[PDB]
Amino acid sequence: IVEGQDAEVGLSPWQVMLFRKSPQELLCGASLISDRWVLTAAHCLLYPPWDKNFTVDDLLVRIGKHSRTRYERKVEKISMLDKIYIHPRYNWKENLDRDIALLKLKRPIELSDYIHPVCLPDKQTAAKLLHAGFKGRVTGWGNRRETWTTSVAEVQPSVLQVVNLPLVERPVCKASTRIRITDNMFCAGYKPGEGKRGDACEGDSGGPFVMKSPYNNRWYQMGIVSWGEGCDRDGKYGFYTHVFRLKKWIQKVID
């Protein structure tokens, strides 16, 4: 998270880190939507150009963490995966359209103060909440800065990071890039004249973009961190997979 701040303990209880089994490395973010299901970005799993195609055997999922500098053992869960569901119309060749994946956990998990699922949106909530200018929130352990060379300096939070970003109108999103944006994706982030900054960065993808409903006091997952050109560049925005548009697919793979 470029320009975010340290998350509060218990801030994001649906956060999930997708790790590489051995050598263990953080590959992406993810979120808990039930005691058996984790939601993430397909590209975190399959990207043919880089011969990437992880299986349930090279993966591990960590849950209940807001500080990456220790094995939080007592509040933290590590689970193996049972199954991986990738959208059959995911597009890695041209623009990562339908960049969504579902991970079934091996065994259900025991919720706690630190482990609790977020809500998927319904027809009326997406209506109320999806308006340019409304702010959502992105979380993750990814890099705190984009960069050149190595830039191995800093860029690695020891605590989960948070940044709230505004929803940008579709026409501004389309004109910021020469990539064909589809209806299964929305962009968020500040405009050049807003002075403020913030964006998702490497290692944050697959993570959640949530918004709190004033009508029921609940947090709802509106997007999945998907892609962008660089991190926090002026005139550019981050692109998120539109959860509500993919709601149908999510529903078919759970029943």
């Binding site: 701040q5 509060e8 303990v9 218990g10 801030l11 209880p13 939507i33 039930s34 005691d35 706690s112 103060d113 630190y114 609790h116 699922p117 977020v118 809500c119 200018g133 409304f134 702010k135 959502g136 929130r137 948070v162 709230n164 505004p166 918004m211 709190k212 409903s213 004033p214 006091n217 609940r218 947090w219 709802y220």
Partner: peptide
Amino acid sequence: EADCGLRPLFEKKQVQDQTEKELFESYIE
């Protein structure tokens, strides 16, 4: 779930987090 989106250390505790007002302020703009 059915009790999704309500946090144990926040909503359940009538405690609003540090940056929540920034979100709400954006809604009524």
